[PDB]
């Protein structure tokens, strides 16, 4: 049995649990990206990557038990569900929280804008490399990973370019520029600074607590401060265990997951090693519900949003990471970084096309929105539209000089080929500048038709026609003049 987890979690506690149960545990760095290419028997990670793992077939579907379904919280089960099936066993729910030193400051600031004043008085710092920690500031002002509508996620819609995300990133880079926040700092430096008491504040999850418990300094956790009157919305992660599909000990690992580590003594042991935060199991969560830190983490989780499970998340993280790094060092502006991330997000673009769009955004930022719109249109064209269509519909239905036939033709053309709507509308407009009956039959042997407003006009026309060709009864029933 081989287990791979992140280095900041409770590796020793899980090792003791496995020794009680042979079991081998490791915590390699960058494990979340080498796991898909290598394929460990079971891997502990957040639920975001497990969707892509299941799509690629790297994770085997787990057969559950109804009592085991009732043992844990339901939203954990729904969050770990991809395409209606369960792939991983929920273990813990982690949400970011603000940790402050009580001696440094009595009360945490309610707003992010007050933090520069506190820092200037001191003369807060945290991890910047990972997009995970940066994202709450971006998403506080309305930014979002994907549009969650009616219970499904819209891949075609991306919210990293919203004005709120721009405002949050500009605020962060302004904190960087004023020497309040180092752009090169990472998680280890943040932990070292907070353990030494150099920084008055930090953003971190439950797992850091044990580390700060080794610092013997009082620490208080709470909800992250609001941004421009809007509460921060950190992504809510679910740490769960996924089973390798190629593991020769699949049933052994499944029994280990069900009967040993997802039990009270295993959870309490790993929590003693490193605080896992909100555990999905009901009994141990109620036991730890009295702890105010878990209550603050739960409040942050409710204020935040549950991290999605679409396989299109990983590259999204990558894109955001690059943008944040591009925002961090001052190599480029916030708007440029968000545009580059947006270009990086959509998958159907070819690598050469993506590089061309990168250069296009590099050499001309004045038309960035046009470039983004054209790239999105190309992406949907190569993907394996109603916005402008309704506007064109409404404009044409109001056309005053256009007769009914031409309006119907233009409407049919719009409904038929929407991608050429913008041209067609203009053509209709052009026509707007320029414009500013019963068929009767005659039964020399042969039949003819002519369009006339009434019977006598058609009779006159038919009599003329007969006159030119060397030739009377009329039937309303068949609308027909017969000549003999």
């Amino acid at each position, epitope marked *: 049995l081989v287990i791979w987890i992140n280095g900041d979690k409770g590796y020793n506690g899980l090792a003791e649990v496995g020794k009680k149960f042979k079991v081998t545990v490791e915590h390699p760095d960058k494990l979340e990206e080498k796991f898909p290419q290598v394929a460990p028997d079971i891997i502990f990670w957040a639920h975001d990557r497990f969707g892509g793992y299941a799509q690629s077939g790297l994770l085997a579907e787990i057969t559950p038990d109804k009592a085991f379904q009732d043992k844990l919280y339901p939203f954990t089960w729904d969050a770990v569900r991809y395409n209606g099936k369960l792939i991983a066993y929920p273990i813990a729910v982690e949400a970011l929280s603000l940790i402050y030193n009580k001696d440094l400051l009595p009360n945490p600031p309610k707003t992010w804008e007050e933090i520069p004043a506190l820092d200037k008085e001191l003369k807060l710092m945290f991890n910047l490399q990972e997009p995970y920690f940066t994202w709450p500031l971006i998403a506080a002002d309305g930014g979002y990973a994907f549009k969650y509508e009616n219970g499904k996620y819209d891949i075609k819609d991306v919210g990293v370019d919203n004005a709120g995300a721009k405002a949050g990133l500009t605020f962060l880079v302004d904190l960087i520029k004023n020497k309040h926040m180092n752009a090169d700092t990472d998680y280890s430096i943040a932990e070292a600074a907070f353990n030494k008491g150099e920084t008055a504040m930090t953003i971190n999850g439950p797992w850091a607590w044990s580390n700060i418990d080794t610092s013997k300094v009082n620490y208080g956790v709470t909800v992250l401060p609001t941004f421009k009157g809007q509460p921060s919305k950190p992504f809510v992660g679910v740490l769960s265990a996924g089973i390798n599909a190629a593991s020769p000990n699949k049933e052994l690992a499944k029994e280990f997951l069900e009967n040993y580590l997802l039990t009270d003594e295993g959870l309490e042991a790993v929590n003693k090693d490193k605080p896992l935060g909100a555990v999905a199991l009901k009994s141990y969560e109620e036991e730890l519900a009295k702890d105010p830190r878990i209550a603050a983490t739960m409040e942050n989780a409710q204020k935040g949003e549950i991290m999605p499970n679409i396989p299109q998340m990983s590259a999204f993280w990558y894109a955001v990471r690059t943008a944040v790094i591009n925002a961090a060092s001052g190599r480029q502006t916030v708007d440029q970084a968000l545009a580059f991330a947006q270009i990086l997000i959509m998958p159907n673009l070819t690598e050469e096309q993506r590089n061309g769009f990168i250069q296009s955004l590099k050499d001309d930022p004045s038309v960035s929105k046009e470039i983004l719109a054209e790239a999105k249109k190309l992406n949907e064209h190569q993907a394996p539209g109603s916005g402008d269509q309704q506007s064109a519909f409404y404009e044409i239905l109001n056309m005053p000089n256009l007769n009914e036939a*031409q309006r*119907n033709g*233009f409407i049919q053309s719009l409904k*038929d080929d929407p991608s*050429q709507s913008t*041209n*067609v509308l203009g*053509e209709a407009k*052009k*026509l707007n500048e320029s414009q500013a009956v019963t068929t009767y039959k005659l039964v020399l042997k042969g039949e003819t038709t002519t369009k006339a407003v009434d019977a006598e006009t058609a009779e006159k026309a038919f009599k003329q026609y007969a006159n030119d060709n060397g030739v009377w009864t009329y039937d309303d029933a068949t609308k027909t003049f017969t000549v003999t």
Partner: antibody
Amino acid sequence: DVQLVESGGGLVQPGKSLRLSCAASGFTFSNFGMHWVRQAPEMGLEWVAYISSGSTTKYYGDTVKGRFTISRDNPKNTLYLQMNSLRSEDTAMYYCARRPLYDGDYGYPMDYWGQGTSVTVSS
Amino acid sequence: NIMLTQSPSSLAVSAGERVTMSCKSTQSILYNSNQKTYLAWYQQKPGQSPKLLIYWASTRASGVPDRFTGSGSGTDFTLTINSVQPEDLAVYYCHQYLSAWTFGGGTKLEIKR
């Protein structure tokens, strides 16, 4: 054998609209791209419109872009061309043609042509 | 879009000898990946739809006789009939299908007797 039949031609006043339909038989229509090509005595053969097999890719002539719309109905094996804002230079005969599969690999151009319908515009 | 111009236009000949009708291209239509020139010769009898005669400027379409032959390269191409027959009177178009689709002006083959 592969057969293509056009319909919908006739006489329409300038500025009005018209619809041309091309019915295909004898082959899997849902797998081939289609072309609309018009010919006049004083203009000759000139490509007008093209639609791919899955209707994802469509191209239009320079002089007809913005007025003509090309589409297809795979389940009933039909190809539609909607013509709008007609001018006096559009009087011609229209054919629907079938573009072979993977012409970037075998180089086979438009091979089967329909009989064509005569569309004339005048006041 | 690439414009094609056919030089001979109307041409009269008796039955039995060769005829050479040439057409010039504004741009080179040589595809680089497979080194194949993309140009076709179409024959249209009066009151008939165009019928494919030659594709890739050298290859003969299935069912055509061996009298028809295509040659040329660069921007100049020729179609040659070795023995013109009494039912060979038609209009011959050279058409490129590399960039968009365009047709030539059309040369009319007239028959002398």
